[PDB]
Amino acid sequence: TNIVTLTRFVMEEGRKARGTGEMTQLLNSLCTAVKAISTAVRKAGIAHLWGIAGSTNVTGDQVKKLDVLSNDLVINVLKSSFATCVLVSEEDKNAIIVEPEKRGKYVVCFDPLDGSSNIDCLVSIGTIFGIYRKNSTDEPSEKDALQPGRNLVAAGYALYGSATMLVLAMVNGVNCFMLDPAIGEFILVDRDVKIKKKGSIYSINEGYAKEFDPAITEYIQRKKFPPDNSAPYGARYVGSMVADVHRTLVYGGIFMYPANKKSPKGKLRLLYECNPMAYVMEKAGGLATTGKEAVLDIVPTDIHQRAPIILGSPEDVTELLEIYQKHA
Amino acid sequence: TNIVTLTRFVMEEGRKARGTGEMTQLLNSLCTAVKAISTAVRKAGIAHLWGIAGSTNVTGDQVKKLDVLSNDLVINVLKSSFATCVLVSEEDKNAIIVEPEKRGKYVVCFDPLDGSSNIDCLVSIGTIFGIYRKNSTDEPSEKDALQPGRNLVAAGYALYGSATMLVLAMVNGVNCFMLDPAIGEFILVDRDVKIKKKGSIYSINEGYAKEFDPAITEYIQRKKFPPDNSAPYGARYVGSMVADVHRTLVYGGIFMYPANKKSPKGKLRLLYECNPMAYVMEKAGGLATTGKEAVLDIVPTDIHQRAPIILGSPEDVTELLEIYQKHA
Amino acid sequence: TNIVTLTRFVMEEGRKARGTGEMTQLLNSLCTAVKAISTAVRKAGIAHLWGIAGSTNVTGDQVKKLDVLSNDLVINVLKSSFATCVLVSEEDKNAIIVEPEKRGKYVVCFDPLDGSSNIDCLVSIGTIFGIYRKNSTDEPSEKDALQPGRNLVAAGYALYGSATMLVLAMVNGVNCFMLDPAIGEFILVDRDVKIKKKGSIYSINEGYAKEFDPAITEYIQRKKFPPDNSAPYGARYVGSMVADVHRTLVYGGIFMYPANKKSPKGKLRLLYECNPMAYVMEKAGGLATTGKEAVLDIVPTDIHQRAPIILGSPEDVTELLEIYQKHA
Amino acid sequence: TNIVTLTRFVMEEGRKARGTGEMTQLLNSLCTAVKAISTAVRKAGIAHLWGIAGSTNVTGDQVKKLDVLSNDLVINVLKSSFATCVLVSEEDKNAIIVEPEKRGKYVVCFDPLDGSSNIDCLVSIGTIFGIYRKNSTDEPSEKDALQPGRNLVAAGYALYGSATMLVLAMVNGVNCFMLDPAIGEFILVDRDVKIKKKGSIYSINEGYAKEFDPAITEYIQRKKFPPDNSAPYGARYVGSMVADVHRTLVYGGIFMYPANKKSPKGKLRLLYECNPMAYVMEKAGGLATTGKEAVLDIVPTDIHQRAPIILGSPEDVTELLEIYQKHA
Ligand SMILES: O=P(O)(O)OC[C@H]1O[C@](O)(CO)[C@@H](O)[C@@H]1O
Ligand SMILES: O=P(O)(O)OC[C@H]1O[C@](O)(CO)[C@@H](O)[C@@H]1O
Ligand SMILES: O=P(O)(O)OC[C@H]1O[C@](O)(CO)[C@@H](O)[C@@H]1O
Ligand SMILES: O=P(O)(O)OC[C@H]1O[C@](O)(CO)[C@@H](O)[C@@H]1O
Ligand SMILES: [Zn+2]
Ligand SMILES: [Zn+2]
Ligand SMILES: [Zn+2]
Ligand SMILES: [Zn+2]
Ligand SMILES: [Zn+2]
Ligand SMILES: [Zn+2]
Ligand SMILES: [Zn+2]
Ligand SMILES: [Zn+2]
Ligand SMILES: [Zn+2]
Ligand SMILES: [Zn+2]
C-alpha cells in the first residue's frame, strides 16, 4: 500500500537539487514507452511483429519490425515529454531535433531495441539510453549528441527478460526497478547496486577467435586455464548486450565485445550502447574500457560511431587491461 | 475472434484417435501451472521470490524459492487433472505416486524450473516435461518412470523468456504456442516446426575447456577455424537449457552439454531434461545424442540419472558424432 | 499454489457420474470466450468497440459492436469444443446447427452480451447461457432448443463488473468463480450459494409505471409503504439483467421485469435470458415466475420468445404471486 | 504508437500556464493509486478483500476492507507527490496535514471508495476527488479544506466499472481517460465531454418515497406520467454515486439524492462526493443543485458535511428547481 515507484524514487532524489523536474518527466515518458514495448514483445509472435521491416540502418543492420514500433514509441514519448531537444537513435540516420514548442534541455541517445538476433527465439532483449544535458545555448543540433560519456547525467536500460526491469544509474548510483504487470509501475527491487570486485564469469562471442587479438586470446585461455590452479570461470553469452551486461552487474564478472582484425572499433555503438552501459557499470563500482582507454572519455565524432567495449568487475577488467598493456 | 488455443489444437489432433481425452486434461492443467509460474517469475523481485529455499536436491542443487512454488504448482495441477499416476520431479527424492482417486494412465517427468543460475538476472528460464503412458497394469511405481525417451507420447517445455512460450511435440510433430497475457491462452504461433539441416551457431559452456574431451575440443576449434575456409559459427550460450535448446530449434545450429573428465554422464538429468528435449528435437527433424548413442534409446536406472547431451541440426550433430567416432 | 479453478471444480463433480466429459470441454471453451469478451470490454473505448454494428436482430434490438465480437467469439468456441450440436443466440435469426464433424450432445442458448444500454457508460454487462442435452436422436434442429427451462443440465452467466465473475449452476447447486486477471483462470470464490429467504431490495424499471399492471403497482407501493410499519425496501436497478440478478443472488431481494399493457410477454427473452436466470435462481433456493407460472415450466414455441420474469428471494417472490392471485 | 496518456494531455494543457507542474505530479500519483485499487477490486473475492474492516467512520458508515486499502493507497501516494498540504478523506476523522518535507500547494478531498453497498455484488464502484489550491499563507490546517466547490481547480473520479475510467474536469472542460490494462496508462477516449440539454433517464432511490418531499414526489410522478403525453423517462439507479453520475454525464438525464423528512441535508458528503460531481457536471454544461442553491456555492462548516444533490442535464435539473420553487 506504500508503493515505491521509480517516479517516487527519482523525485525523492532530485528533491534536494530542486530542478525544473523535466527529468522526472523525461523518465516518466520513457517508462510509458518501455511498458508498450514490453507488452508488444510479450505478444510479438501472436501480434505478428516478427520479421524484417524492409530497410537497413547506417550501421548496416537489417531493420526489424519491433525496431520500428519501439523506435516510434520512444521518439514520440520523448517529444511529448517537453524535456528533450536533440534525439539520437540507432534507427535514425541523423539526429532528430525537437520542434521548439516541445523542446527541453535534455539530449537523449537510445537503442530502441537491443539484441536483434534474439527477438525471434524469445531471448532477453531491451532498450538502452543515455541522457545528456545540453551544455550550450547554441541552436539545438547533432553536435549536442557528440559528448563523451563522462557527461551523462543519467543512463540505463529496459530489460525485457523473464521479467521487465528498468535499471537506472545517476550521479549517486544505480538502482533496479521491476515492472509490476498488475499496475504498470516500475517498483524498486535492488537499491544502490554495487558490482562485486571480482566475478567468475566471462562473456564474449568466441566464434570470433580467429579474428581476436593477442590480448583477448590470452585472457580467454587464462579464464579456461587459470595459472594459479584455481577454478576456471564459467561462461555465459546470451547475445543481447542488455542481457549479458545486466547479468554482469548483479552477478559480477566480465563482458567483452573487443575489436578484431576485421573491426578496429569493435561492433557496439558508442552513443547508444557503450556509454550507457559504461556509465551504469562505473556508477556501480565497475569498469568499462576499450582495451586502451576509458569508454566514457571517448569524444564522439559520429553519432553512429562504434567502439570496442570490455566491462564488468574491477579486478577482471583490470587483469585484461594489464594484458593489453603487455601486448602493446 | 477465432482463437486457435493449444486446447483447440490438441483436441483437433486427438480427435481422430478418439481417446479418453485425459491428455487434453493433462495439458490443460499443465498450462494452468505454467501461467502461474510465468506470472510469479514476471514479478519475482517484487514478490520476494528470489533467494534460496534452504535445502539440497538429490542432484546436489541448491533449491531456490521459485523451484518450490513451481514444483508445488505443477505437482498439484497434475494430481487434480485425474490423468496421471506416477510423477517424477527434479525436486523430489522419489517418484510421487498419485492417490487412487485421482489416478490417470500418464507418467510425467518434469523439471519445475530450468535455468536456476539465470533466475536472479532475469535471463530466460522455463519448465520441461515428458509424458509417458503407463505401459503396464502393475500397481503404479517409480519403475514406470524408468522408460527410454523413445516411449514418450508427448513432451515439451514452457519458456519464460521475453514472451512466455509453450513448445509441444507429439508423434506427428512440433508446434509452438505463445501465452497471450490478455486472456491467458496459449495461441498457436509456429505450426509444424522443422529445425534446419545445418546451422551456424554452437552453444556450450566453454569454461570447461580443460575438462572437455578430445572430440568436443576438436569440434569447437573446427567451429572457430573452419577447415574449408568458410565463415566460423557464431556463439551463443544463455545458460538455461530451455532457452538455448529453443533457440536451436528455431534458428538451427547445435547445443552441447557433453561429459568431461569430472563427469562421465555429463550434467543434465536424463528423465526431465534430456529426453524431453531429445524428443522435441527429433520430432523437428533434428538429432540428440550423448556422443556415442541416441539419448532417447537410453533405458534409465535412476530417476535422477544424468546423461551427456549434444542436440540440434542433423548435419551439425552428425559432424560431431563423426569426430567422436574418429577418437574412439 | 493449489489453485481451485472452475475446471478442477467441474471435473471434481462430474467425476462421480463419469461421463464423456464434453461438458468440461464445453465450459472450458466457454471460459475462453468469456475471457476475450472481458478483455475487449475492459478496453472497448480505447479499442473503438463502442457504437452500433449497423443491423437489427429479430427482437428489434439495435445490434452493437460488442454484440458481434462476443457473438462470434462464443459461436466459434462452442463449435470448436466438439460438444455442441445446436446453438441459439439472441443475435442469430435461426438456430445454428453444428457441422457433423464437430457435433456434441449439447444444445446451448446464449445472450452473447447482456445489458446493451450500459455498454457505453461502463456499467456492468455480461453473458448468459443455458445448456440442454439433446433429448433425442433425430437429426439436430432448432426444435432441440425449444425445451422448458426445467430441462437445463447447467446454466449461468459471465458478469463483467468491477471484477469478472462466472456464476455456474448445475443440478446440485450454484457456485461463483472469479477471473484472476493474472493467470486467466476462474477461481472459486463463493461455494454452494444460497439466496436468503427474504431480502430488502426491489429492482425494476419504474419508468413503466403507467404501463404496469395492478399487481406490480401494489407490490411497489407495498415496498415503499410497508403495511406493518417496517422499514421500506431499498431500491436498485442497474439496467443489465445480469448485474441486477447477480446482486439479487448474493444480497437477496427481488428483481422484476413483468409484462405491461404494451407487452403481454414482458421484454426479456425466454431462451437465453429468463431460463438461465430462473435455473440459477432455483438452484440457489430462490424462485422465478411470470406472475402466473414458473418460468422453467414454460415450453417455448419460438427461440426468440419473450416472457415476463419476477425472481429472487422465496418470500418476496411469493408475496408478489399472492398479489397477482388476488388480482386475477 | 503515439499514445495520448492523461499525463501527456494534462501537460499539454498546463503548458500554456507554465506552472510548477505539481498538478501533473498530483494527478500522476493519483493515477498510480487508482490503478492499484482497480487491480485490487478486480480480484477482491480471490484476494479476500470482501468484508468489513471493523470500525465506523464519522458518517457512521461501516468501514469495509477496500475502504482501508484504497484510503491508504491514496493517502500515501498524495503525500509522496510533493504536491499536497492538506488532505480530507471520508475515512479520516480529521484533516490529514502533510509533513513539511513533502508539502505542496494543493488541498485534496477524496472518497477513497464510493459505492460501498455494491462492492460484494461486483457492481461499479470508484474514487472521487476534488482539488483546491491553498488560498492562503497561514500554516496548513483543516480550514483549508472548508472551501466552496466553486474554488476547485480540478476534480473528477475513477470509475471501476466493466472498464476502469478516469474522468477529469478542469477550468476548460471535461475529458474521459480509459485505463489500458496492457500498459497501465489512462488513454484519452472522450474529449471535451458535454452533457446533453435534456435526457430521458431519472435516477434516485425510490425506496425513500415515504420520506421524499412534495417536490421530489411531483417530479417523479411527472417522469412516469408526462403532462404532455410524451414518452416517460426510463429509470436507472446503480447504487454507487460514481456509476450513476458518470452515466448521467455521457447519456444525459438526471441523478438525485435529495433530502427527506429524516435528513435535512440529504446523505452524500459535500466535500468528497457532491462538489467533485458538481464541478464535473458544470464543466460539462450541466447543473448541480440542492433544490434551493448551487452545490458549488455552499461554504462548508464541517469536512464531513452532507448536502442534498440533484444534478445532470440543464433542462431536467431546471424543471425540478421550478417545482421546488412552486412548493416553497
Ligand atoms: O552476434 P554477435 O556478433 O556476438 O553480436 C551480439 C551483439 O549484437 C547486438 O545485438 C548489437 O547489435 C548486441 O545486443 C549483442 O551483444
Ligand atoms: O553453468 P553450467 O555448468 O554451464 O550449467 C548450465 C545448465 O544448468 C542447468 O540449469 C541445469 O542445471 C541448465 O538449464 C543449463 O543448461
Ligand atoms: O431499459 P429497460 O426497459 O429497463 O430494459 C433493461 C433490460 O434490458 C436488457 O438489456 C435486455 O435487453 C437487460 O439486460 C435489462 O434488464
Ligand atoms: O442505498 P442508498 O440510500 O440509495 O445510497 C446510495 C448511495 O450511497 C453511496 O454509497 C454513498 O454512501 C453512493 O455511492 C450511493 O449513491
Ligand atoms: Zn541494430
Ligand atoms: Zn537496436
Ligand atoms: Zn543494441
Ligand atoms: Zn536444479
Ligand atoms: Zn529445475
Ligand atoms: Zn533444468
Ligand atoms: Zn439485444
Ligand atoms: Zn444481448
Ligand atoms: Zn440480454
Ligand atoms: Zn462510506
Ligand SMILES: [Zn+2]
Ligand atoms: Zn467511500
Ligand SMILES: [Zn+2]
Ligand atoms: Zn462515496
